[PDB]
Structures are given as structure tokens and as C-alpha cells.
Amino acid sequence: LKKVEDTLTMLVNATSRQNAAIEALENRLSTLESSLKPIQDMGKVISSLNRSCAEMVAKYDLLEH
Amino acid sequence: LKKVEDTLTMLVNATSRQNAAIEALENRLSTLESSLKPIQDMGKVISSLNRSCAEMVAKYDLLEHHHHH
Amino acid sequence: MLKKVEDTLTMLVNATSRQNAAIEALENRLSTLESSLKPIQDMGKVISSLNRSCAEMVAKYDLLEHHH
Amino acid sequence: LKKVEDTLTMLVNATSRQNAAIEALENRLSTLESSLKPIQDMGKVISSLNRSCAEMVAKYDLLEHHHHHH
């Protein structure tokens, strides 16, 4: 009785320690995801720079060769 | 028995919570995995830019060379 | 009474094993996620290289202006 | 106590295995945070590339337009 009550309350404590540790891993993933949010729409910037550079190549080739 | 039965109920609840916590964690990883896809998809376009930018450099540098010397 | 107590504990043993398997599967997904970052890192190098290159050509254009 | 004590010991050992599994997850997450740093910073470098590549284009357009008319 005494040894098992002592064990059960350890388990409740151990489980809640695990819980906090899981929730803390969740927050680390949130932080990581929100930091990647500004980068998500920057494929179009890269695309526009590729167009510019491609247009300059085309303009060069036209006006000279 | 009563102190055992109450501490067991707390443990059921603690275990119920942990299941929910693991699933919230699973879901937040899915969302992270999703956030990286559009960044992975910038591969092709970055390589395009790399070729076309290098091609503009080679051609226009030559022209700054002849204008200056 | 006592029969409810023993199988509720068994229920928790099975529950905790499934959590364990779920945590180990999370870890598996994190390795896989890491491995896949290598090409995105490399894209970053190219981006860094192209920036320094474009900065370098602006500088070269300016020196001619500073000269004659 | 018979059935209860032997279930408890399994539950105690399972809760102990869980701690180790959670810790291995923290390790792998620390390494994932480390590997994501350069990617978290490339948004900045993309923006700086935007303005320096834009500056290169506008200025080299002039160089070539001057070269065309002369």
C-alpha cells in the first residue's frame, strides 16, 4: 500500500515531467516554423531576378551579335 | 484503497494529456515539414538564376573591360 | 474494486508503449527531415555566392567611374 | 497486491524508457535547430542579393546603352 502509493505519485510526477518536456519540444518546432514564414514567398523574387538576368543576356546578344 | 484510486485517476488524466501532447507535437512537425517544401522547390529557380547571372557577368564584364581598356 | 484497478494499470502499460512507439517515430521523422536540409543549405551557398558576385561587379563598375 | 505490483513495475520501466526516448528526441531537435540556422538566414541574403543584383542590372544597362549609341 505505502510502497505503491509512493510509486503511483512518482509516476504522476514523472508523467507530468514528460508532458512539460513534450510541450517544450512543440514550442521549439513552432519557433522554427514561424522563422521560416518570411522565406516562404521568396521564390518569386528569385524568379524575377532570373528574368532580369535572362533579359540582359538577350539584350546583349541582340544589340551586338 | 481510496488514496490509490485517486492517484490512479490522476495518472489516467496525466496519460490522457500526454497522448494529446504527442499528437499536437506530431501535428506541429507536419506543419514544419510543409513549411520547408516551398523552400525546397526554390532549387530549380536558384540554379536557373545561377546560370543566367553568371552568363550576364561573363558577357557584360567583357564589355566593361573594352570600354575601360 | 481490485479487478478494475489491475486492468486500468494494464491499460496504462499498453498506452505508455504506444506513446513510446510514437515518440520513436517522431525521432525517425526528425532524422529524415535533417537529411533533406542538405540541398537547401547548398542553395544558400549559391545565393551567398551570387550576392558577393553581384556586389563585386557593382564595385568594379564604380572603380572605372572613380578613375576616368 | 500480486497483480498490481507486477503491472506497476512494468509501468515504472515504461515511464523510464519514455524519458530516454524523449531525450533522444531533444538531441535530434538540437541538431535540427543547428542545421536550420543557415536556412533561417538565407531570407536576409536573398534580400541583399535582390538589391545588389538590381544595382548590377540598372548600371550595366547604362554601360551597354552607352556602348550602343557610340
Draw up the topology in text.
The structure is a homotetramer.
Chain A: H1 2-36, H2 43-63
Termini Cα gap of chain A: 95 Å
> What string gives the helices and strands of chain A in order?
HH
Overall radius of gyration of chain A: 29 Å
What is the number of strand segments of chain A? 0
Subcellular location (chain D): Virion; Host cytoplasm
Family (chain D): Belongs to the filoviridae polymerase cofactor VP35 family.
Organism (chain D): Reston ebolavirus (strain Reston-89) (REBOV)
Region (Homooligomerization) (chain D): 12-63
What can be said about this structure in brief?
The PDB classes it as viral protein. The structure is a homotetramer. By secondary structure, chain A is mainly α.
